[PDB]
Design a protein around this nucleic acid. Structure first.
Length: 91
DNA sequence: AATAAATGGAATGGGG
DNA sequence: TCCCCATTCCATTTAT
């Protein structure tokens, strides 16, 4: 099964949900979600995973928070903005 | 207040 | 057994 950070990186690479997520500074790996259109992206994550309940942005962001310590994704001090690690970006 | 976002502990569920 | 990689639930705090 695909990991959440890889799902998000793949979306950014494909441009399939450009109104829900975008690079802010792609060289640094910073990206941001749409305030108004993030829920459609969260729904897609839950469906891809086959989860029991409907996925929400809040639950997706709760999973993103768990990457902070291991480092794959960190929260940036702007709203709805995160940053991939260099290791994630290279792979 | 209404609306949104953030913080994050804890219980529960996946697939080895 | 017990870690992986989340998902789900819930209470609380901050937004300037």
């Amino acid at each position: 099964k695909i990991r959440l950070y890889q799902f998000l990186l793949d979306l950014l690479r494909s441009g399939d949900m450009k109104d829900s997520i975008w690079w802010v500074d792609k060289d640094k790996g910073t990206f941001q979600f749409s305030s108004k259109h993030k829920e459609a992206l969260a729904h897609r994550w839950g469906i891809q995973k086959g989860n029991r309940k409907k996925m929400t942005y809040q639950k997706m962001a709760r999973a993103l928070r768990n990457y902070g310590k291991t480092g794959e994704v960190k929260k940036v001090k702007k709203k709805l903005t995160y940053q991939f690690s260099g290791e994630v970006l290279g792979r």
